[PDB]
Amino acid sequence: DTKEQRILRYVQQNAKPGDPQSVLEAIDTYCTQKEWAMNVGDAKGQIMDAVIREYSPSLVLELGAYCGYSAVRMARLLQPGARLLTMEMNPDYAAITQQMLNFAGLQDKVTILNGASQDLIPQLKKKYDVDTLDMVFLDHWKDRYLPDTLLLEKCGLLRKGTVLLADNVIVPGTPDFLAYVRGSSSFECTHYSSYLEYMKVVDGLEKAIYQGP
Ligand SMILES: C[S@@+](CC[C@H](N)C(=O)[O-])C[C@H]1O[C@@H](n2cnc3c(N)ncnc32)[C@H](O)[C@@H]1O
Ligand SMILES: Cc1ccc(C(=O)c2cc(O)c(O)c([N+](=O)[O-])c2)cc1
Ligand SMILES: [Cl-]
Ligand SMILES: [Cl-]
Ligand SMILES: [Cl-]
Ligand SMILES: [Mg+2]
């Protein structure tokens, strides 16, 4: 019995089937009251919500799904026909995420790619019929944010205006990625100060908009 299985069971026992808001609030309640877990959480998630609503992306890539909290959070705000692709290398967690999306009734909007971002990113265009991404949510191991950004650019997946939105740029921190995009004329960056999920430790999201080659 894993913490992720516990989160899922608590959602099935407490949330309303087909109600993404209810599912979010259930996961937040469990992780606030019973066991901390690395979901983006409600404070940063409200910022995510506002960004999603501003850009109305048709195609979103998420890096790191975990239990599907952020996937539910973003998918519930997508326009009809818009898509989220989420990459998750832990098969146990990917299983839990799929069940979480099913419960929320979001399964038709979200596609889970099992495996490591660095292996899956080069297969996106061919295997998933992707041209360029409108938005990317980076929230996997922090040492991959920079390498996967370079890899996205190499594979032609970024267009002028693609929005990168990065979690945890303060804590645990992503120093190479943050130095890189803030220093590069290829990105326009904005910092949104907030708090680490379920705590009062300061963290923040960085928005880095690709400006083209
Ligand atoms: C912080 S959790 C994702 C949380 C999720 N975005 C949310 O807010 O609910 C990080 C996840 O990244 C996954 N992960 C780490 N490195 C990865 C990689 N290179 N490719 C795919 N998934 C990876 C881990 O297995 C874990 O599920
Ligand atoms: C041992 C330990 C230390 C710090 C954290 C932690 O704070 C954390 C928070 C996140 O939002 C997050 O995305 C990740 N991550 O992907 O590794 C870790 C989680 C576990
Ligand atoms: Cl590598
Ligand atoms: Cl929170
Ligand atoms: Cl705290
Ligand atoms: Mg995170």
From Swiss-Prot:
Binding site for S-adenosyl-L-methionine: V40, E62, S70, E88, M89, G115, A116, S117, Q118, D139
GO cellular component: axon; cell body; cytosol; dendrite; dendritic spine; glutamatergic synapse; membrane; postsynapse
Cofactor: how and how many bound: Binds 1 Mg(2+) ion per subunit.
Binding-site residues for substrate, renumbered to this chain: K142, N168, E197
GO biological process: artery development; behavioral fear response; catecholamine catabolic process; catecholamine metabolic process; cellular response to cocaine; cellular response to phosphate starvation; cerebellar cortex morphogenesis; cholesterol efflux
EC id: 2.1.1.6
Residues bound to Mg(2+): D139, D167, N168
Coiled-coil region: none
The reaction(s) this protein catalyses: a catechol + S-adenosyl-L-methionine = a guaiacol + S-adenosyl-L-homocysteine + H(+); 2-hydroxyestrone + S-adenosyl-L-methionine = 2-hydroxy-3-methoxy-estrone + S-adenosyl-L-homocysteine + H(+); 4-hydroxyestrone + S-adenosyl-L-methionine = 4-methoxyestrone + S-adenosyl-L-homocysteine + H(+); 2-hydroxyestrone + S-adenosyl-L-methionine = 2-methoxyestrone + S-adenosyl-L-homocysteine + H(+)
Keyword terms, alphabetized: Catecholamine metabolism, Cell membrane, Cytoplasm, Lipid metabolism, Magnesium, Membrane, Metal-binding, Methyltransferase, Neurotransmitter degradation, Phosphoprotein, S-adenosyl-L-methionine, Signal-anchor, Transferase, Transmembrane, Transmembrane helix
Class of enzymatic activity (EC top level): transferase
GO molecular function, one term: catechol O-methyltransferase activity
Protein family (similarity comment): Belongs to the class I-like SAM-binding methyltransferase superfamily. Cation-dependent O-methyltransferase family.
Function: Catalyzes the O-methylation, and thereby the inactivation, of catecholamine neurotransmitters and catechol hormones. Also shortens the biological half-lives of certain neuroactive drugs, like L-DOPA, alpha-methyl DOPA and isoproterenol.
Protein name: Catechol O-methyltransferase
Organism: Rattus norvegicus
